[PDB]
Design a binder for this molecule. Structure first.
Ligand code: CDL
Ligand code: CDL
Ligand code: ATP
Ligand code: K
Ligand code: K
Ligand code: K
Ligand code: K
Ligand code: K
Ligand code: K
Ligand code: K
Lengths: 674, 27, 557, 190
């Protein structure tokens, strides 16, 4: 809430924030100029000026300085919360970055060298309990690395060389065996070091939404300044002109000091909330562009559900023995590394165990399976036992003597009707049938997708399968559309087609094949398991390897925009009560009949003006937690959200200023200051 | 239109010009 | 009383939409660059003769065309008024105008404000009234409709840079919308008893014997385009109180219909050109709600009237002073609200003789930027600016990007919308400040107390907001007043037309998307209330202190 | 030429049309169709013009129906000024003028009610109002009756015969043409 260990120093930072740093914010510069001129007027008025009671002008000057101090307190406190989060997570690499090798494969003579000037090309071996010097990927080996000092959980996570789980970060010391690390980039200009550098070396970097709202606030400041400065020639002829300090007090009470002082605090506090959600973002422009996206690109595996397919099914086809089908399956799977595949073949093993299948990898080679290859062929003695997908099997047996009966087509049609992932693995030109792979679609995903489809969020996903099973899974899951036959150029084409309609694209990629999509995507996040080629070529990264939190990323961005709009509406709506408190009080001598407009029956004109200034000063310190946290966000449609916001921030903004001015005036009357 | 009116008009015109320049060039 | 007023409002706003739907379809046809049936051959022949054929110019050339035509018309009108003595058709041998009055009325007629600080029947000649004033009323109305044509074309056009042909638009508007309806309205005026003669001034042998001179002239030709284009520059000193201009209550009703005819038809045309009539329905609903509230408030104020009438002894306390007896206080209130919200400026009752709260609402209705059926196209693009502000606020308040009919409203559009909003309150406040601290500005008084400042504020508000309606107690024939109001009218027209054309140029370059599930609809009662609240808040937060020192102080006195 | 030919051509054509065709066509159409209306609605005594039927004249005699007061310059009911009174609702000058008008009407009409109608004491919008309400006409009945020795039913019949009603009762007011009424009184007397 209010950590005193940072309030006590950032208050001094605010005290040093007053001179010449208010020039960037125009509303803050107007209230600063008004405070300075009113203070000078009171100083000259207590000594050698004709009008008396300079104590009222001094109190006005003091409260006009206090409201500037409170707005600077908001901005500095939110910026210091961002800096405190950055300093809390900056301890990943602080001392003894002195690990290197001699031989790139397995070197010796480990000594102390400065690693802050190393270009890409160096290979670093880390032993047990030693901090990783720089980001990169594993080349040889693999170990259970920990990420406790960088992420939230303190659970070690395994790594493998040559697989998808090949990424290391210079954070928590590794509690495992040896692991070589290839240096991705020179330390200092990586993603994490760059964001700590730009938080410590703070850049404002006004987003276009912030600039447009600032232009609106400047226009309001101009009309209020004109309507206030024109009051003196108006009221000079009608009697005695109003004092300048009353005019400056009314001008400060009129201009949107609330949202004007809380705009930068809202922006950097939304950024702080992003860093608190284990998501590290380059720009607040990207943070807000994550909000109001049309399509939401995911994949069927992991984001929807990891699946863990467990289904051993048979065929009533021309194949002779399902025992021989399982024999071919276990011949293909002797050192299977994929989890769903090894679970399927161990279900086949408990279905029908095989003798003499004692990991015979001496005479057999292994072909790794990737997203681009989709092939895992194993040669046992002289054959080519197949493991690929349906398109790959069509492609490679369409060349040499293969043919397709329609029976496998009705089999995969039945598999699609049931709802599964069809594997049609064979031996050669002989067709061995289909093995269905049932995946679970469990998890609280349909409720959040239903609450997101009210928000103008298309939820097209890239399944990487055939068009029938993907359609069935999408229909039972509840997403809008789907994409089958995953290919990076197809993903680029779909993203460019959606962006050609003026629709923003939100997506998630991990590998280096997704790097063009990370580049030419409007908003995109990348998990910690991704490589540097995708981490440095994307707008946003994910500190925790969970690609299902971009929905709360969208929620936080929309919270930022709704907070800006709600406090703008509050600042605009307060001016009605500011009129009802000041205008019948300002002209208490020029037009004595104007006291009928004092609907709150306040005590005295000076007390009324002072109470209005106290409320205008204290509304910022009362709206500190709303600006630091965000609005009470609920998943409603656009019209429902608009009417709920117009109710709350737009009826409170018309009601509670009256109550605040009345309570402050009553407290001043009870205390007897006036 | 005494010296107080002149300096008030000058200050208000300076503030208006500053705000117009801020609106035109708002980065 | 209340039932009669409600029936009057109901039949006015019924016959208005009845007469404005087919004119709305016609103006939509002129927006969509489709010629009217049976007129394309003559149009092609006229364009080939004039050399005004298809050019399809962008926003910069459109703006330069409109400003060039308006400045050329200003120069011709100014020299015509300065040299009216040598011109023919002057039966009264009226002398040439002074430089200040001539410049003031030239800028007033050019900028569609039509502020008249002179007395027409003893100041301006038959040739001046018949030619220069009428063609400048036609040109100002055509320029306003052409600018709003450019804005609607920018809203309906996708990924282009052009905005049609400004000369083609001006000729089409003037020849197929303004002139024939003006013929119908003027011939109805001669049916009801207006003037369309060129006879000299007629001496009258009175029944008692006090000889009076009757002014004549081409009244109805000016009157028809004055009501159609919402111009407001009457033939005589009385804008529409004079019996040679508005002789019948039926004529007054026809005048009110002609005042609201073109803005309502342009709202219908905008709604039909977008392809969704709900947007025009939204605009008309917001304007009608504000209009009915203002009309009811002013009617109640004038029925309450002067409280001193029963004290001094009168049949009733209704404020019939400064109102013609051919029209009730209800009808005078309705005409006041119509011509002050619509930026017309014509008066059948002197607004100075109105009560404090009854003249409060015309002041606010000018000061809000004239968005309640204002002008002919000026009010429609002012309401477009307020709609852009409202959709920006709504987009922030729902957390989406600010968009309106598919087009995303960006930072440049916000800057130009803010500037166009800023121009006229700055003008009225600066002009009232200048006129409230000078001897020449404070020496044009007729009423003391807060009402004199109300007179000054009404004059500067009508100058800045292109209304031209006057309390007429202000002696605005001074050189300082003429120059100040001429500057106010010039900037109030051409510091608002320019950023609207820049907004149109920003609008053509963008592309409109479709309506999604999360896209907030810009129609319906929620957005109608949001737009009404935006207009009321913006027009109030600038002028509550000024009205508080003026009409509010006078009412509470 | 920087494209000045279409600008000058359009301005010249629109000037010529809307200042020499539309007023000219409307003038010839009006003078051909309704010349009495288009020529001022002048009421004539054969050669002597007694005044327009819409303007209204300053009537001060006892035997003439007095209209609304006029604040035109240099004389009441001056058509060369045509400007009504612009006094505010909180104006002591307007209060004094209304007091003087009420006193004058009460002195001129002793047989009528003590309360005077609004139109007879408040100035019109243009100072050229030919019309008063039939309630004010009925209030002014007894003075004209005593002056002209004419019966109340005859004066009421004459007023109702020279009273104009609108198309509906709420877009305007019932009105009495006072110039035509006074001319009818003069013709009835002689
Ligand atoms: C106090 C707070 C503030 C309150 C303010 C309230 C605001 C008042 C004004 C409302 C603003 C409306 C804005 C939208 C524009 C409307 C145009 C339109 O598209 O219309 C359809 C549209 C709805 O249709 P849609 O399906 O959405 O549109 C689809 C199509 O595009 C169109 O479908 P369509 O083709 O069927 O359209 C109808 C068609 C109809 O065809 C025609 O009539 C034209 C063609 C025939 C020509 C000849 C006919 C002659 C006249 C017709 C009458 C029949 C004869 C009777 C004789 C009397 C008259 C001579 O043509 C028209 O469009 C003509 C318009 C006529 C209807 C609309 C009239 C609007 C105002 C009505 C009274 C104003 C009340 C003011 C008092 C408020 C005080 C609280 O109407 C509306 O939006 C509703 C407006 C009705 C107002 C009701 C609420 C007002 C407040 C209650 C007061 C009581 C009202 C009645 C009082 C009567 C005395 C007791
Ligand atoms: C400010 C504090 C509080 C604000 C928050 C309040 C907002 C929400 C209120 C209620 C929400 C609670 C949830 C309940 C469910 C919905 C209830 C409902 O029906 O409510 C309708 C609606 C909200 O519902 P919705 O989301 O549209 O969806 C439900 C509709 O039924 C669906 O609509 P639809 O499109 O399907 O059409 C259905 C139909 C029927 O549905 C209904 O609306 C229900 C039945 C109504 C009558 C039946 C139909 C008859 C047709 C004729 C219409 C009669 C109206 C005539 C009299 C006019 C009265 C003024 O609607 C019609 O009435 C048809 C004609 C269409 C346009 C009519 C416009 C009439 C004027 C209404 C608003 C004008 C207010 C003036 C004052 C504004 C503030 C100054 O509420 C309103 O009317 C909103 C009024 C106030 C809006 C916010 C005010 C903002 C002011 C401050 C501005 C900010 C400061 C400045 C910032 C910028 C400066 C720099
Ligand atoms: N070990 C494997 N060898 C060959 N093919 C496999 C293997 N495991 C899965 N496949 C098949 O490859 C295709 C890839 O589908 P899958 O959804 O698993 O894609 P992915 O590469 O894991 O990534 P994503 O879901 O993000 O596109 C499917 O047809 C699947 O049955
Ligand atoms: K504004
Ligand atoms: K006007
Ligand atoms: K006018
Ligand atoms: K405006
Ligand atoms: K405005
Ligand atoms: K206008
Ligand atoms: K304007």
């Amino acid at each position: 809430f209010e950590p005193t260990l940072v309030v006590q120093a950032l208050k001094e930072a605010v005290k040093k924030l007053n001179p010449q740093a208010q020039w960037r914010n125009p509303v803050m510069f107007i209230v600063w100029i008004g405070s300075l001129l009113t203070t000078c007027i009171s100083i000259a008025m207590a000594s050698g000026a004709m009008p008396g009671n300079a104590l009222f002008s001094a109190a006005i000057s003091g409260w006009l300085w206090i409201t500037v101090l409170f707005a600077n307190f908001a901005e500095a406190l939110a910026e210091g919360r961002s800096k405190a989060q950055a300093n809390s997570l900056k301890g990943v690499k602080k001392t003894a970055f002195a690990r290197k090798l001699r031989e790139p494969k397995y070197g010796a003579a480990a000594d102390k060298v400065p690693a802050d000037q190393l270009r890409k090309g160096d290979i670093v071996l880390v032993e047990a309990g030693d901090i990783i010097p720089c980001d990169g990927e594993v080349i040889e080996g693999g170990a259970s690395v920990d990420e406790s000092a960088i992420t939230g959980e303190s659970a070690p996570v395994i790594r493998e060389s040559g697989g998808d789980f090949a990424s290391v970060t210079g954070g928590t010391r590794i509690l495992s065996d040896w692991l070589v690390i290839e240096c991705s980039v020179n330390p200092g200009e990586t993603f994490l070091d760059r964001m700590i550098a730009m938080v410590e070396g703070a850049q404002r970097r006004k987003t276009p939404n912030e600039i447009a709202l600032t232009i609106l606030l400047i226009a309001l400041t101009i009309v209020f300044l004109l309507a206030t400065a024109t009051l003196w020639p108006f009221s000079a002829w009608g009697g005695n002109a109003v004092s300048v300090t009353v005019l400056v007090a009314l001008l400060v009470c009129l201009i949107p000091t609330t949202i004007g002082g809380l705009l930068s605090a809202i922006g950097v506090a939304g950024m702080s909330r992003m860093l608190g959600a284990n998501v590290i973002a380059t720009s607040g422009r990207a943070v807000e562009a994550a909000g109001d996206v049309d399509v939401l690109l995911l994949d069927k595996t992991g984001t929807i559900t990891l699946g863990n397919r467990q289904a051993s099914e048979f065929i009533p086809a021309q194949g002779v023995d399902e025992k021989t089908l399982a024999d071919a399956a276990q011949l293909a799977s002797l050192a299977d590394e994929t989890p769903e595949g090894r679970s399927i073949v161990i279900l086949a093993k408990q279905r029908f165990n095989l003798r003499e299948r004692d990991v015979q990898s001496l005479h057999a080679t292994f072909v790794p399976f990737t997203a681009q290859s989709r092939m895992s062929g194993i040669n046992i003695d002289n054959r080519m036992i197949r493991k690929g997908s349906v398109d790959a099997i069509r492609r490679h047996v369409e060349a040499n003597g293969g043919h397709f009966p329609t029976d496998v087509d009705q089999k995969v049609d039945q598999v699609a009707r049931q709802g599964a992932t069809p594997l049609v693995v064979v031996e050669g030109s002989r067709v061995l049938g289909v093995i269905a792979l049932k995946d679970i679609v469990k998890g609280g995903i349909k409720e959040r997708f239903a609450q997101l489809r009210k928000m103008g969020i298309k939820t097209v996903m890239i399944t990487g399968d055939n068009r029938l099973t993907a359609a069935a899974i999408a229909a039972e899951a509840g997403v809008d559309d789907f994409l089958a036959e995953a290919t990076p150029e197809a993903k680029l084409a779909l993203i460019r087609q959606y962006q050609a309609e003026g629709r923003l694209v939100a997506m998630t990629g991990d590998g280096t094949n997704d790097a063009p999509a990370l580049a030419q995507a409007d908003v995109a996040v990348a998990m910690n398991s991704g490589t540097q080629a995708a981490k440095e070529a994307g707008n946003m990264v994910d500190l925790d390897s969970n690609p299902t939190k971009l929905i709360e990323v969208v929620h936080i961005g929309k919270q930022m925009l709704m907070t800006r709009g709600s406090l703008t509406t509050f600042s605009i709506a307060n001016d009605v009560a500011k009129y009802f408190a000041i205008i019948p009080a300002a002209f208490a001598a020029t037009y004595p009949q104007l006291n009928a407009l004092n609907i709150m029956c306040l005590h005295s004109p000076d007390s009324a003006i002072l109470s209005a200034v106290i409320f205008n000063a204290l509304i910022i310190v009362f709206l500190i937690p709303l600006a630091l946290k965000g609005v009470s966000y609920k998943p409603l449609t656009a019209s429902a959200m608009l009417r709920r916001n117009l109710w709350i921030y737009g009826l409170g903004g018309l009601l509670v200023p009256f109550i605040g001015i009345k309570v402050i005036d009553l407290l001043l009357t009870v205390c007897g200051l006036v | 239109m005494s010296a107080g009116v002149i300096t008030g008009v000058l200050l208000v015109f300076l503030l208006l010009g500053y705000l117009v320049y801020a609106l035109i060039n708002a980065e | 009383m209340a039932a009669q007023g409600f029936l009057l409002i109901a039949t006015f706003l019924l016959v208005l939409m009845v007469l404005a739907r087919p004119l709305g379809s016609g103006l939509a046809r002129l927006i969509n660059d489709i010629p009217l049936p049976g007129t394309t051959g003559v149009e092609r022949v006229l364009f080939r003769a004039l050399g005004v054929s298809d050019r399809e110019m962008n926003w910069k050339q459109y703006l330069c065309a409109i400003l060039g035509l308006n400045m050329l018309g200003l120069a011709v009108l100014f020299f015509m008024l300065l040299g009216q003595h040598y011109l023919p058709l002057n039966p009264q041998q009226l002398p040439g105008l002074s430089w200040d009055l001539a410049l003031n009325t030239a800028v007033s007629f050019v900028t569609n404000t039509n502020w008249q600080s002179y007395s027409g029947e003893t100041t301006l000649s038959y040739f001046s009234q018949m030619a220069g004033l009428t063609v400048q009323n036609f040109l100002s109305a055509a320029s306003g409709i052409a600018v709003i044509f450019a804005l609607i074309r920018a809203f309906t056009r996708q990924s282009m840079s052009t905005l049609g042909n400004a000369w083609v638009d001006l000729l089409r508007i003037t020849l197929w919308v303004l002139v024939p309806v003006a013929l119908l309205i003027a011939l109805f005026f001669i049916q009801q008893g207006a003037l369309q003669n060129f006879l000299p001034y007629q001496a009258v042998n009175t029944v008692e014997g006090a000889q009076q001179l009757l002014p004549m002239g081409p009244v109805a030709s000016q009157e028809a385009i004055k009501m159609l284009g919402t111009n407001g520059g009457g033939f005589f000193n009385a804008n529409s109180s004079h019996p040679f201009e508005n002789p019948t209550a039926l004529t007054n009703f026809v005048q009110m219909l002609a005042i609201f005819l073109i803005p309502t038809a342009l709202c219908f045309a905008f709604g039909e050109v977008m392809g969704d009539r709900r947007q025009g329905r939204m605009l008309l609903w917001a304007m009608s709600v504000i209009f009915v509230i203002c009309v009811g408030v002013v009617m109640w104020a004038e029925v309450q009237g002067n409280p001193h009438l029963l004290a001094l002894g009168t049949d009733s306390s209704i404020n019939m002073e400064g109102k013609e007896s051919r029209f009730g206080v209800l009808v005078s209130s309705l005409f006041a609200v119509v011509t002050t919200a619509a930026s017309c400026g014509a008066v059948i009752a002197m607004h100075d003789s109105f009560t404090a709260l009854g003249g409060m609402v015309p002041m606010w209705l000018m000061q809000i930027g004239e968005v309640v059926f204002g002008g002919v196209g000026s009010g429609l693009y002012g309401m477009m600016l307020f709609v852009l502000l409202a959709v920006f606020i709504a987009g922030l308040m729902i957390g989406r990007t600010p968009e309106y009919l598919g087009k995303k409203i960006d930072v440049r559009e916000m800057k130009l919308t803010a500037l166009a909003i800023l121009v006229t309150p700055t003008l009225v406040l600066m002009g009232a400040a200048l006129a409230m601290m000078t001897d020449a500005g404070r020496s044009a008084m007729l009423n003391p107390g807060p009402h004199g400042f109300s007179e000054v504020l009404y004059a500067v508000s009508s100058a800045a907001n292109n209304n031209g309606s006057a309390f007429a107690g202000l002696s605005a024939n001074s050189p300082f007043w003429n120059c100040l109001l001429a500057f106010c009218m010039f900037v109030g027209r051409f510091g608002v037309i320019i950023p609207v054309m820049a907004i149109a140029g920003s609008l053509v370059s963008k592309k409109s998307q479709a309506a999604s599930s999360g896209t907030l609809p810009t129609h319906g009662p929620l957005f109608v209330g949001l737009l009404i609240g935006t207009v009321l808040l913006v027009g109030a937060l600038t002028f509550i202190p000024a009205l508080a020192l003026g009409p509010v102080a006078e009412y509470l006195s | 030429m920087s494209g000045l030919r279409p600008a000058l051509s359009t301005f010249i054509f629109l000037l010529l049309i809307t200042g020499g065709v539309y007023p000219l066509l409307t003038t010839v159409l009006g003078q051909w169709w309704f010349p009495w209306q288009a020529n001022g609605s002048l009421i004539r005594e054969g050669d002597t013009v007694r005044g327009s039927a819409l303007i209204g004249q300053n009537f001060t005699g006892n035997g003439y129906f007095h209209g609304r007061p006029s604040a035109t310059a240099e004389m009441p009911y001056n058509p060369q000024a045509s400007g009504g009174s612009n006094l505010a609702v909180s104006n002591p000058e307007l209060d004094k003028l209304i007091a003087a008008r009420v006193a004058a009407l009460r002195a001129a009409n002793p047989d009528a009610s003590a309360s005077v109608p609004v139109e007879l004491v408040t100035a019109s919008a243009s100072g050229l109002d030919n019309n008063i309400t039939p309630q004010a006409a009925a209030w002014q009945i007894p003075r004209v009756a005593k002056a002209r020795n004419l019966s109340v039913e005859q004066l009421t019949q004459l007023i109702a015969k020279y009273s104009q009603q609108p198309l509906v009762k709420y877009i305007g007011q019932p009105v009495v043409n006072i110039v035509e009424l006074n001319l009818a009184l003069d013709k009835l007397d002689e």
